[PDB]
Amino acid sequence: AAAIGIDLGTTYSCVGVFQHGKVEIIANDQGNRTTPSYVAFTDTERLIGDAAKNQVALNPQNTVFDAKRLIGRKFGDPVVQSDMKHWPFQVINDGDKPKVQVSYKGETKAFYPEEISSMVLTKMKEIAEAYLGYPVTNAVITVPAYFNDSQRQATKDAGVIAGLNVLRIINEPTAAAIAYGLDRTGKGERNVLIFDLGGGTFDVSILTIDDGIFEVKATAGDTHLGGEDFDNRLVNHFVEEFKRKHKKDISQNKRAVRRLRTACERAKRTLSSSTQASLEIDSLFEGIDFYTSITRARFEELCSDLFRSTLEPVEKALRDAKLDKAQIHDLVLVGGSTRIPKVQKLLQDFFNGRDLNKSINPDEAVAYGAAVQAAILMG
Amino acid sequence: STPFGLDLGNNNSVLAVARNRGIDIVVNEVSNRSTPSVVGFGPKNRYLGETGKNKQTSNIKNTVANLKRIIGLDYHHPDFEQESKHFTSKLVELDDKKTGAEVRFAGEKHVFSATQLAAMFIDKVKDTVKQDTKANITDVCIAVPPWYTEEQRYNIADAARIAGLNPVRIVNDVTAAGVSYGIFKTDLPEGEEKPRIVAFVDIGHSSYTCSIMAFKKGQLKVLGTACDKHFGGRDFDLAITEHFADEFKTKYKIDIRENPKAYNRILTAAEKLKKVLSANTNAPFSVESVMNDVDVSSQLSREELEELVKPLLERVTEPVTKALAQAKLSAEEVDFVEIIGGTTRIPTLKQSISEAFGKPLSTTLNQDEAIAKGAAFICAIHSPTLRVRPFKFEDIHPYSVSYSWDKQVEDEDHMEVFPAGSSFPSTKLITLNRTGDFSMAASYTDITQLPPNTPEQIANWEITGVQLPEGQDSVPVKLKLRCDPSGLHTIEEAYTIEDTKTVKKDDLTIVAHTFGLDAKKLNELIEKENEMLAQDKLVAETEDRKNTLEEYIYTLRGKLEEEYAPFASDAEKTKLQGMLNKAEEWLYDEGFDSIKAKYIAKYEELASLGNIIRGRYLAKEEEKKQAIR
Numbered sequence A: 001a002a003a004i005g006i007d008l009g010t011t012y013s014c015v016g017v018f019q020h021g022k023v024e025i026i027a028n029d030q031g032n033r034t035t036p037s038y039v040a041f042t043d044t045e046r047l048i049g050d051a052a053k054n055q056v057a058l059n060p061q062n063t064v065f066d067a068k069r070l071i072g073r074k075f076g077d078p079v080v081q082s083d084m085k086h087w088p089f090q091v092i093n094d095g096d097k098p099k100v101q102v103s104y105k106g107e108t109k110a111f112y113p114e115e116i117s118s119m120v121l122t123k124m125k126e127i128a129e130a131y132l133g134y135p136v137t138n139a140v141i142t143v144p145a146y147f148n149d150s151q152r153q154a155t156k157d158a159g160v161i162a163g164l165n166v167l168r169i170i171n172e173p174t175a176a177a178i179a180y181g182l183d184r185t186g187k188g189e190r191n192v193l194i195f196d197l198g199g200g201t202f203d204v205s206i207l208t209i210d211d212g213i214f215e216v217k218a219t220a221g222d223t224h225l226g227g228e229d230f231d232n233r234l235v236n237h238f239v240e241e242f243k244r245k246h247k248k249d250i251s252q253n254k255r256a257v258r259r260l261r262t263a264c265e266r267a268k269r270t271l272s273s274s275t276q277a278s279l280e281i282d283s284l285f286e287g288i289d290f291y292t293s294i295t296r297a298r299f300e301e302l303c304s305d306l307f308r309s310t311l312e313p314v315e316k317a318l319r320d321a322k323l324d325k326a327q328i329h330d331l332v333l334v335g336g337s338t339r340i341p342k343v344q345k346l347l348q349d350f351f352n353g354r355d356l357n358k359s360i361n362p363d364e365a366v367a368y369g370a371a372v373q374a375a376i377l378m379g
Numbered sequence B: 001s002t003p004f005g006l007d008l009g010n011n012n013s014v015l016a017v018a019r020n021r022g023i024d025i026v027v028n029e030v031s032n033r034s035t036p037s038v039v040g041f042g043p044k045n046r047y048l049g050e051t052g053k054n055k056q057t058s059n060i061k062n063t064v065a066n067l068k069r070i071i072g073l074d075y076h077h078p079d080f081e082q083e084s085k086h087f088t089s090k091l092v093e094l095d096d097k098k099t100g101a102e103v104r105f106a107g108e109k110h111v112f113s114a115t116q117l118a119a120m121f122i123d124k125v126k127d128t129v130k131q132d133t134k135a136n137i138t139d140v141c142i143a144v145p146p147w148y149t150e151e152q153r154y155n156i157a158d159a160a161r162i163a164g165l166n167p168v169r170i171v172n173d174v175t176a177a178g179v180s181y182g183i184f185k186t187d188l189p190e191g192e193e194k195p196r197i198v199a200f201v202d203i204g205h206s207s208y209t210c211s212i213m214a215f216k217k218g219q220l221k222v223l224g225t226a227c228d229k230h231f232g233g234r235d236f237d238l239a240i241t242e243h244f245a246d247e248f249k250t251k252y253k254i255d256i257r258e259n260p261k262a263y264n265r266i267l268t269a270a271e272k273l274k275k276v277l278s279a280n281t282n283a284p285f286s287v288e289s290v291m292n293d294v295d296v297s298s299q300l301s302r303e304e305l306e307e308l309v310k311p312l313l314e315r316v317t318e319p320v321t322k323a324l325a326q327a328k329l330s331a332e333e334v335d336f337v338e339i340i341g342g343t344t345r346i347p348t349l350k351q352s353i354s355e356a357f358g359k360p361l362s363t364t365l366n367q368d369e370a371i372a373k374g375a376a377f378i379c380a381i382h383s384p385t386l387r388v389r390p391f392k393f394e395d396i397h398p399y400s401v402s403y404s405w406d407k408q409v410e411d412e413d414h415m416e417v418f419p420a421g422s423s424f425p426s427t428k429l430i431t432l433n434r435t436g437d438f439s440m441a442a443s444y445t446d447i448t449q450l451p452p453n454t455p456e457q458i459a460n461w462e463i464t465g466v467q468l469p470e471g472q473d474s475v476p477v478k479l480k481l482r483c484d485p486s487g488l489h490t491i492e493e494a495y496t497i498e499d500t501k502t503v504k505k506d507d508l509t510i511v512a513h514t515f516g517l518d519a520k521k522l523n524e525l526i527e528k529e530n531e532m533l534a535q536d537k538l539v540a541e542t543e544d545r546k547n548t549l550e551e552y553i554y555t556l557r558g559k560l561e562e563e564y565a566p567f568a569s570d571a572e573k574t575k576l577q578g579m580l581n582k583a584e585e586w587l588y589d590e591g592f593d594s595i596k597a598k599y600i601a602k603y604e605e606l607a608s609l610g611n612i613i614r615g616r617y618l619a620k621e622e623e624k625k626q627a628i629r
């Protein structure tokens, strides 16, 4: 029987398994290679994964996500207090342990964070078991580098609840580094920086590796970046265009903005793989067609401050590590936003042309390394 | 050269390659593990794959999807309409009575055959692979549906040739999935042991295939195969769209059937709703501005969806029952049922397949990758530089095939050569007494066993160079009749014998007339493809040189203001800002749509001065590092 690697993500999870000399990332029964870390409670049932995320807007008080933010934390944690203001679900105090409170089958129920995460882990276990065709009972689970003993232990408890034997809790950037084989270089100290940007979260980690042994040298989280701010720049740019060509302002038109916005989100995505993108919205405002385009270079320019700001945590992490940028040996990119060419450019131009580890899907590189490490721990 | 397998799907295509000690999935320019099977056309260039898809909703009239489905399609085929209803572009009859797409492209009206169109896509997808692999790719194995006709297999093989590839084998797709099953499972029965019986069910965008196979270590045989070519995800999307078409007439007083663009918006949204319904039991349906100013907001339950496709689901067990009857077995004799294809994620289908086999479903293959991986393994089997672990497989030959010959001195003028329900590939050796040059042909022994309107004749041959010996009566000609690994009916050798001893005398020349194209026609089509490729490439490179210019303007402007500031005189800075400003304004005027050379020229004026400042900046950087070390 094979061991599995699980990235228990704050928003999405991912499971892999090492088989026949390679890591296989396993698709769930809907065909998706990541599964939302969502757990929904309803009048009749419990839904986990895609089913849970699919009905969030119709059942927002009873659809739990972000349990990773609560796990291993005290209720009076300033982070817990801060975060509560952003969730549409209730979090209660029970002995100074946070619990998410919910309507489930016509009853009021509270759950520990590790109980919500265990249900996500049961899901990843079932995904792995359906693919392999046998019971899976051994897992490496990953956590962020900044996790404390309690956060680490609470995650292991979630594993144990899911029925897993947690072989090891490993750091996410460690996992990403193992994915790229950076632990194989033998004796001698190597500085690796993992740049993890995607899903509105940003973590820079510097690790030192020596004889396959990892040490966390620095972590730096600029916490919120990669979303609606880029969308707004594009929206404002095009609102201006329309104002210029047709001499009319669309700013104070609620539906038209959401429409032009949808167009800009699409266009943005296209520009990660193309140097230009067309926008074409039928009768956008007062019966007037808005067919235009934007170049990649123009998009980057509109958002140049928003892009440059990604190097702040890099420069911070370097300081805490007490390292010059010239002392970093290897770069690893994780998280969806690292697909953005400008992100890759900025990083490379900052690090003087140094090559980037980026060939593994940046959403999958952590589950990948965890799956590698799970097979090592069984061999 | 690296073996390349192609799962050419109606909706998406999967790319796999055989390298290192294994087989890898090739990822596209957008990093996707499949590429949309779309050929679109614009005023300047073609939109192929991902870009085709990106442009699709804005140019539906000039975007062809359903590429697979129009290969070898008679324009007046009794079931043309089941094909054409899924097209958004203009279809037209070709000179051979087949169907092409008419399209506005580069400012003119263009007609392309299904072969040409499929070649364009194969060529794009070939480029993805050699940009990923850095390698030379010359050979493909293409996976097709088992219902593909002999003609259709020749057609798609010619499509590969127009894309500059050698179609090393055209493989049945779930045979390719079964091969990838076989090469990856490590516990297969080994000797006198009963083989493992595994049924494979593939339901995709357009087709539903059941194929039942016997496995031992290093081998498979296909026992039974049945298809419904009119059962797929696209039929669910369409039933959902038609349901909402009716609903919106009463609810919103709008008629989306009279508005192709509106209709297409609903169709697109209907697939997303269908997928939600594989996970959830109810789903809202919300589409903003389906027309001018009109937002629709409705819903659908899984049970309502299941009712919508009731007429389709009446046929849900047929490919299973048909594949078992062919295999000459009962459902209980199947050990495992493996499920692949996107449409098998639908709960009603899963229950129906499970119930028809009396077994739980297995999912130990990646459903999306299995066919492409098997196709890449099969492509490797064909490389002269052999380094694959061998795997033997035989596929089913559903129809009886006879060969005929100029009678002459033979008592018979035909015989059954390849029986109904035998295997391919297969070679049959015959010797015939001959009075001179002669014709031959291959045909279906019983045409009633074939699809409606199937011509009986498969191929014919003109065999010449026959010379009679001294006793000028007859002479024995030895023939090699081959159903090749693609299941194609060939003659691959003919020679005169009888030069106390038997001996070859004269090697006879064979002229073949098949569904394959002439070398003259092949080269003409290869030419057209090369021209379109050059045009696409010119446009892609000029768009790149211009985005590179615009980026450098912004980048060098910011650097002059920051880290380059100490490294430029006032005269150097203001000169360069002036030309930066002027280059930016040019990109809105004459440079809005200029030529490659001018984007390069403009960049070189700027960079030639910018590099001088950079080279001062870099010098003091290195200097500070000597003050370090």
Ligand SMILES: Nc1ncnc2c1ncn2[C@@H]1O[C@H](COP(=O)(O)OP(=O)(O)OP(=O)(O)O)[C@@H](O)[C@H]1O
Residues within 6 Å of the ligand: A029, A030, A031, B008, B009, B010, B011, B012, B013, B068, B203, B204, B205, B206, B207, B232, B233, B234, B271, B274, B275, B276, B278, B340, B341, B342, B343, B345, B346
């Ligand atoms: N979770 C899901 N639930 C329902 N349908 C799905 C799901 N995922 C994918 N599909 C459908 O599966 C189809 C794509 O499947 P697939 O890749 O097997 O087709 P294909 O190979 O392109 O088509 P074909 O084999 O007919 O040429 C699409 O219609 C898609 O909507």
Ligand SMILES: [Mg+2]
Residues within 6 Å of the ligand: B008, B009, B010, B204, B205, B341
């Ligand atoms: Mg398919």
